[PDB]
Curated annotation (Swiss-Prot), chains A, B:
Activity regulation (UniProt): The cyclooxygenase activity is inhibited by nonsteroidal anti-inflammatory drugs (NSAIDs) including ibuprofen, flurbiprofen, ketoprofen, naproxen, flurbiprofen, anirolac, fenclofenac and diclofenac.
Record carries keyword Disulfide bond: yes
Keyword Iron: yes
Residues that, per the record, bind heme b: 357
Annotated EC: 1.14.99.1
Pathway connected to this protein: Lipid metabolism; prostaglandin biosynthesis
Note: The conversion of arachidonate to prostaglandin H2 is a 2 step reaction: a cyclooxygenase (COX) reaction which converts arachidonate to prostaglandin G2 (PGG2) and a peroxidase reaction in which PGG2 is reduced to prostaglandin H2 (PGH2). The cyclooxygenase reaction occurs in a hydrophobic channel in the core of the enzyme. The peroxidase reaction occurs at a heme-containing active site located near the protein surface. The nonsteroidal anti-inflammatory drugs (NSAIDs) binding site corresponds to the cyclooxygenase active site. Conversion of arachidonate to prostaglandin H2 is mediated by 2 different isozymes: the constitutive PTGS1 and the inducible PTGS2. PTGS1 is expressed constitutively and generally produces prostanoids acutely in response to hormonal stimuli to fine-tune physiological processes requiring instantaneous, continuous regulation (e.g. hemostasis). PTGS2 is inducible and typically produces prostanoids that mediate responses to physiological stresses such as infection and inflammation.
Catalytic class of the enzyme: oxidoreductase
The entry's keywords: Dioxygenase, Disulfide bond, EGF-like domain, Endoplasmic reticulum, Fatty acid biosynthesis, Fatty acid metabolism, Glycoprotein, Heme, Iron, Lipid biosynthesis, Lipid metabolism, Membrane, Metal-binding, Microsome, Oxidoreductase, Peroxidase, Prostaglandin biosynthesis, Prostaglandin metabolism, Signal, Transmembrane, Transmembrane helix
Function, in words: Dual cyclooxygenase and peroxidase that plays an important role in the biosynthesis pathway of prostanoids, a class of C20 oxylipins mainly derived from arachidonate ((5Z,8Z,11Z,14Z)-eicosatetraenoate, AA, C20:4(n-6)), with a particular role in the inflammatory response. The cyclooxygenase activity oxygenates AA to the hydroperoxy endoperoxide prostaglandin G2 (PGG2), and the peroxidase activity reduces PGG2 to the hydroxy endoperoxide prostaglandin H2 (PGH2), the precursor of all 2-series prostaglandins and thromboxanes.
Outcome of swapping residue 354 to F: Abolishes cyclooxygenase activity
Subcellular location per the Swiss-Prot or TrEMBL entry: Endoplasmic reticulum membrane; Microsome membrane
Name listed for the protein in its UniProt record: Prostaglandin G/H synthase 1
Length: 553, 553
């Protein structure tokens, strides 16, 4: 017969389990629901559900009435909510992890083979009628067409919140620590073990590689001097696998710890920023700690930057993204009261949802100059010709695409979005609406309801046949935005839990790690605590330019 | 000058940090103490310390007055204490981990390179005057002599608590999951990634190896039929690295997942027991779940046995070891209230303290027959000639050495204890008395106080010069026992936290994992919950013999 699990009968996180020839059962353990499918609510659950406001409403409360928020921020309520935000959001993510591409059930292998992404919902069983469960047509909308029609940039739609390329690239740099999908093993698998903010894009994803980059004196990273300015070394001084155009592969060529940053100037830019940071830090340690070995100076500088990364990410990055009036606060001691696992494992759906290409503009403006994609991609010289100050200034001033809402990827990078849909189909990712459910939301009942506009709605409806069969990635980028947001409801609510668990699940946030000692004393500790995009830039430059995650005025 | 940290100035878990040319500072963050060395107690700490009874006293309460305990066990207090036991004990161990052989300071590498054991206290800095801090002679007592004199069995001292070889071997089997010290990388390093009860001694420490053992039908492990009895397959049917005497390396040769079990008959015995278990379980799954793949049947059987292992370990193993009247209880839901990290990382000191060779007897009695060490070690045929029932019966009936108290390793295996002291010295393990401190105890002020007997006391005293300089491993095995115990104060108090954190830090204990679903439903779940040494034996045999962790009457 039909695999019963193809109907996704078990609700509210209950686990579908096949029995006998053709039966199923749900595991409602700890779901707050009981009954055949986990839909009869417990005493308290039912109180919560009635008294739960909508994601939209909360969003509104947070984006409105600064008078109340200026007061809140000023008091401890800032910490009370920050804690709330941290615990309720985190909690929706399995820790320790659950599944992967091979196992649609907890297993020792899935727990211990750190080479996999995890997954939050299982796969569509291989044996289902329609390719995504029980509804839709047999064939699914042709990837290519789907993007052409709904994701291809018509005219440039700027992000309504003032988000800049200075942000965009940081977004890319940063994420590419833990998105390193494997060429050799294939989709579902990751080179970026560590699965978090390990800075394995500065330090390399392996010790052999990291060892090529280390200067081994005073625990510094290797570098080179071009125009009296510090930059990463060449592969001539640091042999190590870097994907680059063969052509000028010695000098001009650079090595960084993420084998892909050689490509776009904005990547190498941040790589330069952080390297200058690493060494600047060491300088301040060796000051304090003459007796310290090179190894210690290295490992400790690392920890500083890891901490520094997470502060900026939370208090600058996510602050800007969210457009909140609640002033976000990075402070691990907030979670010492709570029950939190200090471990992280990158999920595939996360991989899928962080494909923020729409941010990317039509061209790249550097003061008077205006560079084509053709001119910008692979530009081996652009970083060193312009100088970090002038490039930071540049990106800080140029806008970026409203991520969600649709029709907003520039045609150059459109094929990436196509491949994402292609692998989505390879990974057997469940229907969008099923993910809506798992992240607490109500599933959509129409395409018109998904994106509040008839044209795309009816056209999608015709293509997919059914809203339930609407795929995950399309779902995310086509959904209507809240008023004046970078993206819509489903992006926030599925994005948050992954992001926060990534950030706070880091061991350095742990009670065990989060001490002055661990960052070599107060100067270390306060470097983390007083971290700032503007500091990470200007402390490492001769000049201090415009540096921000939003365009001026 | 002298590295200030060689005095171990920072108390109560405060972290010594070198500053400038010759200064130090303590990191008393969250120690419950403040002041220069972390010795000025906080308001509550001071209340706890006054109101803390001695380890000895508690031990007495637990081993005495069954009338009170028969009542306690019968009520919920059994769970209240079991929880207490679990939380207070666990807590003394860093999670996430701290150091390793390379780093005497938290680092990303030490956090993420799972190839190391961790360590609870740092090393003796390389630059200290005496080889163990500031006291003792320059040279340390000659390993060989130290064992000859104090650890070599005179006459056999049986364990006063009735502990048998049936226990002894389980102890060895079990532990050798997570003690797999690496030949190639050297001391400080481990083949046994997983760092816990992963059953990587049944399933192998790698997927390539595990794949050689799997039958790949109905998710069973490969096997062979000798005398109508099931046993592990030969290397002819399962090629895979097994350390064995070259000689009869085809048939007669066996493969198991731990490359060392080929040696002693009691190891292969348990290997046989668990393999029979694995397949017996699969049989019961395939019954329920016809549609299930081979992969699922395999991963799930695993989880059952992992759970089954931990129940028996806690409720039978540690029960017997402890001689408690409080009836220990394996129940993960006990910790869902608490703040617990569901991760484990095997420490070196743990490695060091679990060298329970003294358990091993003078010879091996199998009913009428009496086998020399010469006859027992490497006996390729002994398992299959005798039959598991008759061998279980045998070990269940023969005693075992009082582990602590001294002078109790049989001369055959004495060199192991020598090597342990040798690597202790390689790993730069801190003084015994420093470990006493870190595990809450008061340091010893005399050798006479360590083992309450003048002869060994004054002789040690002369050899080591100072109690502070007394090494870790000697300390553990020479210390006086509580009345009628298998070992003394320091073994329990340093052993417990590691053991419980190993057991309960397992992901399957997690809220996220601990569901009927995860073990494929109620039959799975109850297999874990109703687990028993006696079941693990008799359900897999034609006959049911004497099977117990203690000798009869
Ligand atoms: C001009 C700038 C950019 C270019 C040229 C670009 C291009 C690409 C390419 C070629 C791929 C790989 C396609 C594949 O493997 O199928 C990719 C994937 C990806 N992109 Fe972009 N992208 C840009 C900006 C961004 C931004 C702003 C983000 C948002 C943080 C981002 C995040 C990602 C991620 C996370 C992946 C998948 C990585 C993995 O699975 O390992 N990229 N992009
Ligand atoms: C006749 C039985 C036994 C023999 C012949 C034996 C012998 C040995 C040998 C040869 C070593 C390795 C020496 C070295 O690498 O320096 C060793 C280490 C060890 N033994 Fe025993 N032993 C026996 C029983 C036990 C028992 C009852 C236990 C207690 C659980 C035990 C636990 C260990 C452990 C945990 C190690 C270190 C493993 C590692 O670092 O990987 N053994 N023993
Ligand atoms: C966990 O850490 C250990 C030890 O740090 C890593 O193993 C070791 O890796 C290094 C570099 O890969 C090897 O060092 C040697 O140094 C010279 C310096 O020029 C190098 O050129 C030589 O080729 C040589 O390999 C070392 O041999 C190797 N072995 C050990 C145990 O020291 C291990 O790779 C780490 N584990 C993981 C998975 O990262
Ligand atoms: C994590 O899991 C992956 C996938 O299970 C492991 O990689 C894969 O390992 C297997 C066995 O080592 C390879 O399978 C192939 O199967 C045939 C069957 O006879 C075997 O004889 C061939 O030699 C062949 O290798 C497979 O190639 C390999 N690659 C992948 C990604 O599938 C990986 O080893 C695991 N990671 C760790 C560290 O355990
Ligand atoms: C909808 C458009 C605007 C609102 O005007 N942006 C957001 O809501 C972005 C956002 C918030 C608020 N996240 C938090 O849940 C969050 C924000 C701040 C703190 Cl402190 C904690 C969580 C995210 C977590 C992850 C994420 O990427 C995947 C985006 C977000
Ligand atoms: C001193 C001799 C007798 C007492 O007569 N044995 C013990 O005390 C052994 C013992 C107890 C009690 N452990 C618990 O702390 C323990 C026991 C039971 C539960 Cl449920 C939890 C912890 C150990 C944890 C680990 C361990 O090996 C390293 C031994 C032990
Ligand atoms: C739980 O869900 C299952 C499957 O989704 C339900 O079975 C369906 O019953 C509904 C209404 O009673 C019908 O629409 C279908 O005929 C059934 N579908 C399938 C696939 O079997 C089941 O009724 C639910 N459990 C209960 C008892 O409410
Ligand atoms: C990559 O960028 C570099 C430097 O940014 C380009 O060289 C400059 O281009 C501008 C206008 O495009 C001109 O003024 C000059 O030809 C160059 N700079 C000056 C003032 O000398 C280069 O052409 C680009 N290469 C690629 C890959 O397109
Ligand atoms: C903390 O410990 C250090 C070092 O162990 C103390 O320094 C010692 O002071 C004691 C008594 O005052 C003397 O025995 C030694 O002369 C000192 N030893 C060393 C190695 O310096 C220090 O006094 C303690 N901190 C305080 C202020 O109580
Ligand atoms: C290993 O053990 C086997 C079987 O347990 C030994 O063979 C038996 O030894 C007993 C007495 O030692 C004798 O009755 C026989 O010689 C054997 N069994 C019978 C009844 O046939 C064997 O000698 C041992 N080998 C080693 C490694 O010493
Ligand atoms: O008021 C709020 O206003 C929001 C923005 O208009 C809506 O999306 C919410 O549903 C509503 O509750
Ligand atoms: O904020 C709240 O946080 C929760 C945790 O993500 C969500 O489930 C709710 O929908 C959201 O409104
Ligand atoms: O009574 C207890 O008796 C024990 C055993 O005699 C002692 O070790 C304890 O110190 C004591 O408090
Ligand atoms: O039991 C108690 O458990 C605590 C945790 O191990 C110890 O510190 C105490 O000394 C012990 O008596």
């Amino acid at each position: 017969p039909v695999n019963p699990c193809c109907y996704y009968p078990c609700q509210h996180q209950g686990i579908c389990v096949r029995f006998g020839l053709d039966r199923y059962q749900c595991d409602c353990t700890r779901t707050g629901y009981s009954g055949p499918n986990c839909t009869i609510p417990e005493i308290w659950t039912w109180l919560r559900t009635t008294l739960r406001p909508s994601p939209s409403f909360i969003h509104f409360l947070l984006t409105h009435g600064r008078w109340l928020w200026d007061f809140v921020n000023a008091t401890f309520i800032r910490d009370t909510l920050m804690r709330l935000v941290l615990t309720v959001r985190s909690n929706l993510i399995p820790s320790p992890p659950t599944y992967n591409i091979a196992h649609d059930y907890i297993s020792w292998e899935s727990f211990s083979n750190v080479s996999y992404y995890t997954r939050i919902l299982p796969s569509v069983p291989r044996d289902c009628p329609t390719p995504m469960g029980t509804k839709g047509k047999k064939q699914l909308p042709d990837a290519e067409f789907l993007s052409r029609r709904f994701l291809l940039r018509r005219k440039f739609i700027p992000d309504p919140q003032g988000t800049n390329l200075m942000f965009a690239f940081f977004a890319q740099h940063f994420t590419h620590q833990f998105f390193k999908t494997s060429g050799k093993m294939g989709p579902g698998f990751t080179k970026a073990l560590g699965h978090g903010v390990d800075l394995g894009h500065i330090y390399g994803d392996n010790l052999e590689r990291q060892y090529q980059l280390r200067l081994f004196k005073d625990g510094k990273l290797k570098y080179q001097m071009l125009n009296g300015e510090v930059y990463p070394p060449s592969v001539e001084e640091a042999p190590v696998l870097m994907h680059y155009p063969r052509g000028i592969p010695p000098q001009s060529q650079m090595a960084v710890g993420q084998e892909v940053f050689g490509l776009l100037p904005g990547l190498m830019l941040y790589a330069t920023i952080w390297l200058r940071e690493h060494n600047r830090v060491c300088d301040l340690l060796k000051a304090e700690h003459p007796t310290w070995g090179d190894e210690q100076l290295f490992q400790t500088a690392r920890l500083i930057l890891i901490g520094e990364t997470i502060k900026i990410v939370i208090e600058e990055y996510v602050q800007q993204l969210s457009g909140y009036f609640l002033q976000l606060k990075f402070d691990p001691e907030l979670l010492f009261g709570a029950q939190f696992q200090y471990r992280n494992r990158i999920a595939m759906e996360f991989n899928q949802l962080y494909h923020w290409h729409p941010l990317m503009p039509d061209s790249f403006r550097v003061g008077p100059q205006d560079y084509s994609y053709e001119q910008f991609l692979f530009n081996t010289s652009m970083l060193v010709d312009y100088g970090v100050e002038a490039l930071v200034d540049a990106f800080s001033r140029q806008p970026a695409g409203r991520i969600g809402g649709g029709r907003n990827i520039d045609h150059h990078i459109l094929h990436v979005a196509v491949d994402v849909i292609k692998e989505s189909r390879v990974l057997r990712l469940q229907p969008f609406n099923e993910y809506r459910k798992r992240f607490g939301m109500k599933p959509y009942t129409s395409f018109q309801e998904l994106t509040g506009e008839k044209e795309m709605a009816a056209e999608l409806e015709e293509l997919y046949g059914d809203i339930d069969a609407l795929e995950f990635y399309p779902g995310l980028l086509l959904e209507k935005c809240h008023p004046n947001s970078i993206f819509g409801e489903s992006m926030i609510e599925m994005g948050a839990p992954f992001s926060l668990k990534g950030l706070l699940g880091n061991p350095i946030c742990s009670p065990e790690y989060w001490k002055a000692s661990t960052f070599g004393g107060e100067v270390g500790f306060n470097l983390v605590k007083t971290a700032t995009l503007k500091k990470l830039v200007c402390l490492n430059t001769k000049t201090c330019p415009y540096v921000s995650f939003h365009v001026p005025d």
